[PDB]
Every structure is written in C-alpha cells, then in structure tokens.
Amino acid sequence: NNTASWFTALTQHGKEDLKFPRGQGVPINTNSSPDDQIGYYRRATRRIRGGDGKMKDLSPRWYFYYLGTGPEAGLPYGANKDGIIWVATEGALNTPKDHIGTRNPANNAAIVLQLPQGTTLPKGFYAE
Numbered sequence: 001n002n003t004a005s006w007f008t009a010l011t012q013h014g015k016e017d018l019k020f021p022r023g024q025g026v027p028i029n030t031n032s033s034p035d036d037q038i039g040y041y042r043r044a045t046r047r048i049r050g051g052d053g054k055m056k057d058l059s060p061r062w063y064f065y066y067l068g069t070g071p072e073a074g075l076p077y078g079a080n081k082d083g084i085i086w087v088a089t090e091g092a093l094n095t096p097k098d099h100i101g102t103r104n105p106a107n108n109a110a111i112v113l114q115l116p117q118g119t120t121l122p123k124g125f126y127a128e
Helices: none
Strands: 010-012 038-044 047-049 055-057 061-066 084-088 125-127
Touching: none
Parallel strands: none
Antiparallel strands: 010 061, 010 125, 038 061, 038 084, 047 055
C-alpha cells in the first residue's frame, strides 16, 4: 500500500499488449540520469458492474516502473510474465533503481507521462 508508479498511465483500447521498439518506451523524467532509463510497464485490468448487473471489462491501463522497483521489483530485465513488458533506453545500466523507488500518492502527485520525440506508440494506446 501507499506505493504507485511515478507516472500516469497508458490506456489500451485494442487487443494487442503494449509493445515498444528497442530503445524506446521509457517516460521522460528530468530528475533521473541516463543510467536509470530502464524499467517495465505493468498492465492493470479494471472491471466494473455494468447496467445488466454483470461485470464488464474496462480498458486496461499500463503503468511504468523503473527496473528493480514496483509490484515486480524482484523481476530481472527481460523476464517473461503476462502483463509485463520491458523497455530501456540504449546505454541504461541493468541495475535496480532503488534510489528512485516508487511514489507515495499521499506525498507526491504522479508525473504526467510523456515520451521523447519520435517514439512509436502502438495502435490503440493513449496516454491519460
């Protein structure tokens, strides 16, 4: 509890999971260094009860966590797991970013997720 991504989410509207080209995907954060630009996105599925009384699936959201932090802090870069996709800027160090850690929403608002110029966002995905 009291732990969250440092950034706002990407919303999925299509059917394909989130995917980034090699070297792309890490959100902008001017308080981090080139060594830190590596991590993963984690899918969060939302389900609400619709008008018919049955549960309906909402659009999935994907949250970025620096490598070695977040709900899959123990996962090494590249580990295969459903809902987890890995991203890294070229040159980033394959080390845990415990100095960055996660965000306490009671203490800090989320950084608005932004991707650098030229990034290919897959079809159906949009930043909140």
